[PDB]
């Protein structure tokens, strides 16, 4: 029972014992695997009263009991080292709100776990056995504050934490000191997304991606996730989406697809908006609103027309939901964009239309702001036309070519450049059986 | 908190304040170097300002950022610049990194100097600061008092000065070891 | 620092040991491709 609970952890420690003698890939991925199966046993009734007794005994095990806080009494230096650390890993696991509610207790514990005899020698030894999420995933909760008077001061524990993560960013020595890292960024990112202005993300950019391989595509996507949101008000759209496009593409998430990928999708949906593309939410009908899309759809629904009021109405309606996702900042722009979009379409299809007939769409809307409004539109390209008011003729271009240009062959080049994608990758993985079969 | 107040402080006058700026800045560089990363040109100009003393602060400050920028010869150079803002026994991984990061750089130089001269190390061509700190780490290696540690360095450090002395000093004939420590190397 | 000096040092051999091979290959590549012909 607690036995079997312990027995599982015995296997974990037994697999920790694998890593203990130089064997992570087993251990970590097992620990990874263990992290999931961790939900099973969970709790910590006799698992720990039997753990703190099974392993060995250490001062910190005592200070850990301050987190335990209970009564058992009863009767009943090596193996009890990183196991204890690996259990401090599970300590954090005992903190999930699994076996906890207020980790603000555990906050200090975390430090008092993190900082002492830990966050010390571990550079290549601990391999992302740090979970700074599960470090912060704790603090994540409490950042429901509100309450804290943030934090302490303002809010320095987080500033500290940032600096502490910074204190890791040093510790990210790239000795392999990586994996967990840009969660730190991601934290800081979402910390920006909490308050700060990401743009130092550019510095965070400037450092790195979570290099590289063994990082969870999840994070690597979650990397992109915020990293998308960089370009959000960085107002790069593709790349933002490309992140999403590199995030949802192969980030592995079903359980976490649920609330969390919606988020992704939300901004993702928000992307094509940035481009005014309005894909068919005909899919985004599905696994969406419910709780995510449909305002986006309403947006799309509006953005299909981009009818400012009807547009605004959605916003008018969903602003809080927007506000809930802070996609509100968006769309304030695509308003006239779609207006200008329509302006472009089923309309520019003459080599003109007039001033006033194209002004008619503005005679539908406004006048001689047209001049601006058209220049407003022409300004961006995003249409191609000309005018002369001296002509009063809003002169709407071809947009007509052939592939005479290198334009296709650009794409061919684009295709060409990709010729190495799977081709060079085949060699990227050629190794593994081929090389391990030698073993 | 946030260094725009410090980036504020940067060009704001009163080298006193700017002293304070750097100092203050320096303590919080760790987080905000990112924010700070942009003012490095001024920071460089600061370090170019002999008028303002502490600018080695800025230099070392820049060094910190440079770590956080990955810039190291930059950092080392401005770690070199500090000497004061910097200390070896100041322990940051960054320090201990630039500590290391310095150490290496010596070798090739020394090697490239060993290339030309084999007494090169007896000479000035290498930044003394480095060579110093280098040997000061050798000291620390001497204080490590397992000198194979020092040796393989000084091996590539090419300083029999180091080696022979460390030997002779440590020659007590660890009877067979002072024989073997030789042999070991 | 040290036992690396023993240890670490030895692995550029491997670095080299790696290095050689592609060479052999490219030859061998060509080798087929020239041998491939009369076939």
């Amino acid at each position: 029972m607690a036995s079997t609970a312990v027995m599982m952890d015995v296997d974990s420690s037994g697999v920790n014992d694998l890593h203990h003698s130089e064997k992570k890939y087993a251990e970590e991925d097992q620990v990874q695997e263990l992290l999931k199966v961790l939900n099973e046993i969970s709790k910590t009734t006799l698992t720990l009263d039997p753990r703190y007794i099974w392993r060995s005994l250490k001062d910190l095990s005592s200070l850990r009991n301050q987190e335990l806080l209970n009564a058992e009494t009863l009767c009943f230096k090596t193996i009890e080292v990183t196991a204890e650390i690996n259990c401090f890993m599970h300590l954090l696991v005992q903190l999930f709100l699994w076996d906890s509610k207020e980790l603000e207790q555990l906050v200090e514990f975390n430090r008092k776990v993190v900082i002492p005899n830990l966050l010390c020698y571990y550079n290549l030894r601990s391999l992302n056995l740090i979970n700074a999420k599960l470090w912060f995933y704790i603090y994540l909760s409490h950042e429901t504050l509100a309450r804290s008077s943030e934090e302490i001061n303002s809010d320095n524990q987080n500033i500290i934490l940032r600096s502490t993560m910074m204190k890791f960013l040093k510790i990210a020595s790239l000795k392999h000191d990586n994996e967990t890292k840009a969660m730190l960024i991601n934290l800081i990112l979402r910390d920006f997304l909490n308050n700060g202005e990401v743009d130092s993300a550019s510095d965070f950019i400037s450092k790195l991606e979570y290099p590289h391989t063994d990082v969870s595509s999840s994070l690597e996507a979650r990397y992109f996730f915020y990293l998308s949101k960089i370009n959000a008000i960085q107002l790069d759209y593709s790349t933002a989406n490309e992140y999403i496009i590199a995030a949802i593409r192969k980030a592995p998430h079903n359980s976490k697809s649920l609330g969390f990928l919606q988020q992704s999708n939300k901004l993702h949906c928000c992307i094509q908006l940035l481009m005014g593309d309005i894909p068919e939410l005909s899919f985004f009908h599905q696994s969406n609103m419910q709780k995510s899309l449909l305002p986006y759809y309403h947006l799309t629904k509006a953005v299909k027309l981009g009818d400012l009021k009807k547009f605004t109405s959605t916003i008018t309606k969903y602003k809080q939901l927007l506000l809930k996702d802070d996609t509100y900042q968006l769309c304030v722009r695509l308003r006239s964009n779609v207006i200008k979009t329509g302006i472009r379409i089923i309309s520019l299809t003459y080599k003109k239309i007039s001033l006033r007939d194209i002004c008619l769409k503005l005679n539908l809307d406004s006048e001689q702001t047209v001049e601006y409004m058209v220049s407003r539109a022409i300004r961006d390209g995003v249409i191609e036309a000309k005018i002369n008011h001296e002509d009063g003729f809003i002169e709407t271009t071809e947009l007509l070519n052939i592939y005479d240009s290198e334009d296709p062959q650009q794409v061919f080049d684009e295709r060409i450049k990709f010729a190495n994608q799977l081709h060079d990758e085949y060699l990227v993985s050629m190794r593994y059986p081929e090389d391990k079969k030698t073993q | 908190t946030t260094a725009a107040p410090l980036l504020a402080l940067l060009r704001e006058n009163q080298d006193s304040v700017k002293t304070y700026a750097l100092e203050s800045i320096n303590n919080v560089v760790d987080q905000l170097w990112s924010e700070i990363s942009n003012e490095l040109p001024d920071i460089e100009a600061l370090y170019d300002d002999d008028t303002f003393s502490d600018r080695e602060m800025a230099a070392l400050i820049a060094s910190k950022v440079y770590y956080n920028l990955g810039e190291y010869e930059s950092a080392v150079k401005y770690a070199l610049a500090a000497k004061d803002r910097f200390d070896i026994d100041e322990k940051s991984q960054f320090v201990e990194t630039i500590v290391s990061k310095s150490i290496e750089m010596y070798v090739q130089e020394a090697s490239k100097q060993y290339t030309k001269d084999e007494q090169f190390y007896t000479k000035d061509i290498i930044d003394p600061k480095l060579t110093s700190i280098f040997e000061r780490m050798i000291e620390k290696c001497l204080k490590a008092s397992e000198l194979k540690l020092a040796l393989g360095i000084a091996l590539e450090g090419y300083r029999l000065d180091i080696i022979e002395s460390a030997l002779k000093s440590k020659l007590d004939q660890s009877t067979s070891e002072n024989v073997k420590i030789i042999n070991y190397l | 620092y040290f036992k690396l000096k023993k240890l670490e040092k030895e692995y550029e051999l491997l670095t080299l040991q790696e290095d050689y091979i592609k060479d052999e290959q490219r030859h061998l590549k060509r080798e087929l491709k020239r041998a491939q012909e009369e076939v």
Partner: peptide, 28 residues
């Protein structure tokens, strides 16, 4: 120091495309 240390990891990591080309020489 640890400078010297993970320097291996490069070589350590290098070890491999090698062994592909090993398979390649074979494969050739």
């Amino acid at each position: 120091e640890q400078k010297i240390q993970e320097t291996e990891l490069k070589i350590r990591s290098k070890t491999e495309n090698v062994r592909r080309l090993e398979a390649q020489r074979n494969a050739l």
